[PDB]
Amino acid sequence: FSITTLRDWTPDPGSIICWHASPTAKAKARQAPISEVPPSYQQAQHLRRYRDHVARGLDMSRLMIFTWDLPGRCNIRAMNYAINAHLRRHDTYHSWFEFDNAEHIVRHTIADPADIEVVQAEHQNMTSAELRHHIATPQPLQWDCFLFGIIQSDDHFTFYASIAHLCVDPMIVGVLFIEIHMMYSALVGGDPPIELPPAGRYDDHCVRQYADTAALTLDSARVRRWVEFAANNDGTLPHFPLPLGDLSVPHTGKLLTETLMDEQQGERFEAACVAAGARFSGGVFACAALAERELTNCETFDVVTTTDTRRTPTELRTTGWFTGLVPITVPVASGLFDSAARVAQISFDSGKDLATVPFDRVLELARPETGLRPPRPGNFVMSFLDASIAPLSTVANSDLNFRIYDEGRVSHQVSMWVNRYQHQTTVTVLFPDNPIASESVANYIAAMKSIYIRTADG
Amino acid sequence: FSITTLRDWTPDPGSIICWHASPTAKAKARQAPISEVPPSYQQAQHLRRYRDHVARGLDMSRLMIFTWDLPGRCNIRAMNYAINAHLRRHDTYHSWFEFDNAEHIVRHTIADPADIEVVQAEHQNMTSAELRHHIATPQPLQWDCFLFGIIQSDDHFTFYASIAHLCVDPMIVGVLFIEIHMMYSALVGGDPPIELPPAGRYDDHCVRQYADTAALTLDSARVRRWVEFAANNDGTLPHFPLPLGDLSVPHTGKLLTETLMDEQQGERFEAACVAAGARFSGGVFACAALAERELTNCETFDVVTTTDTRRTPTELRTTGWFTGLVPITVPVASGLFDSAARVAQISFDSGKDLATVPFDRVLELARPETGLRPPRPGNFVMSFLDASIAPLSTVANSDLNFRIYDEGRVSHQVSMWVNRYQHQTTVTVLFPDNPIASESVANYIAAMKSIYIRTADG
Ligand SMILES: [Zn+2]
Ligand SMILES: [Zn+2]
């Protein structure tokens, strides 16, 4: 729900109890054998980017950081069980990666998950600033790229989780709610550990993804579609359509959050989508496009949006990085919401089949004549998340004050998350911290909101 | 290797020892509970066709029928173990289907595969004609839609297998070679049953396939590609380009086989393909297309060819119907072999990504404005098989006289198999048995062979 920059987090004073991998666990990890399972395309792109930033002296964002609040005194024994069981259950915590001679990514996999163990210790005189630094330390080229802990106050405590994006995606929220919070509540309630269905294996997804992408050629229809999209955006993925200042200097990422609609406005907005022959999501991309139209007078809107490529029951039970990209194109010659939402809905829906084709694969298949290239800083990525019905709902509609923290590290792009909740629809944007980018983003959000409200109140 | 019509099979005299599901296994199967796993699109299409034919009084082909020859006396105990273990190992033998009061296909699944058991009995005084009829009896709407047996002569015996296509596809050959022949050789040598890798589950494939097809819309690129192919062929899949007989009367299927090349012509043909920027397969479709050019003076050649949609290691270890269809289009204006092989190769390779989209899903998504319909009799289907590298090799290059039998039931279409072996390249064609189709097919084959010879030599 709430998304704040880590540097602005002011935890309540209290004792910091933090779980670190044990020395034995670290030794066992170091001697884990090589696996023939590759990194997913998502993991691979991430690891290459992380390597490159390290080589340039830059500190790259690479974490998902959550907290939530509990009353009273934490049962350390129960929490230790919950965390260790969580780590042992999901195979994304059982592998680690490294680059060999050349840029080939090697996977190592711990053979016996029982060897994985984290152990709690108090950070005796750790200050708030030191804790902010500490929680942001995990990085993708260590096996133990995660931290879990608690801040124990007199009569309440706060639980924090910091997990490398390498191992997870937004689905982790729901999973943590069950496997930390519900598990802990069971144990302190006097019950045995909650029984869970078998976890899916992310390794299997990596294997399938490589088999599927290997079946593609430069002339395959889905590849040609990505090629045409990129060619309509100067050989790469779409750039943010407004000036963002000089991105050759490493500004940190800044957050802008805004409420777009209250509950009533949301109901009316969805009704407007339905009347236009679209759904809420179509309206979301229509509003992004019409906002660009208002500020630039463009005829067509191009962006990529993130989507969860899980499909089977087993994948739905799999923790890991399943995010794929859908290429959104919305023609906005008319400037009306109805046609924009209709066509946007078609682009989103028909584009789902393209989300399982990583654009890195397209770049592999492309030749010099194809005229493609990887994006420069300033690319534009959207996301629509329906937190009103998804398991997120259970978290969002829970009494726990669940919070997300951006690490506030160097930013090369604009990420825009539109989130529908039970009682409001909000937008959050992460972007480079300079006055030009701040002005552009602020104007884009203001226009977009005005279009949301205008549509709702027709 | 050899493909014969069942009616023309003359088994050696001997004792017919045949394995039938036991009365207990059949009753237990009858009370198996409903499963939420749907039939695959392939299974579903097949089952609808079989129901429809039965309702129209027609006898449809539905089997894969194989034999091979063994020296000496069959160890009945060892064979019994092998057959039963094969049936228990693969989940395609654990389900059966039926139509409910609606047009919905219901899957039932036996809970404990150990309840599955086949038992041998001698069919005393069964004549050869009675054995031909008997081996052709299995059908897709009974659970035990398979037969296995031996014909024991004085000093040798023949093993026969008749399995509903419902449960298998060509991969079964390799599997039987391991799980019958290799298993049998282990047992009669006194060894334990051979260790096999874990078998894949076809149920999982059905689930995955429905999730994937559900992600498609009429506007998805792959669907639009299938639609354009059908529209480029008068709203359906390609028809055979030569006249046939009156398809409103039920002629049985007829076979035509011809040798295209010897080994030396084969190595030279492949080298020509490689030089032309194509491969053997591209050359195969190039030769079919060029042959149609000489016989019809058409501008482009359109056909569908079969491909194995297995991709992951687990799918490669899964017995079942994975066959999909690739839309092949070859421009044939120039008449040169190099360009035809180039473009045909591109269509084949880039079309692999389309084989996982069932055309029935396209028909679901299509609207009357799309202008499609399910094909009428006379469609044309090719296949290229490389039996020099595939498991077939070991079977093909085995002392065993491995034979395939067509059941000689009603034929509505032309199926063409081009098979490369270590020492020759052959073509087999199944088509409706009337003089008109026989002449058309014969001429087509002659032209095709002549082009093969031209390309291989001078
Ligand atoms: Zn710590
Ligand atoms: Zn029998």
Author numbering:
A (entry chain B), B (entry chain A): 2 to 459
From the paper:
We provide an important correlation of a genome‐based mutation to a molecular phenotype across two predominant clinical Mtb lineages of the Indian subcontinent.
Surprisingly, the A83P mutation did not map to either the catalytic center in the N‐terminal subdomain or any of the substrate‐binding region of the protein.
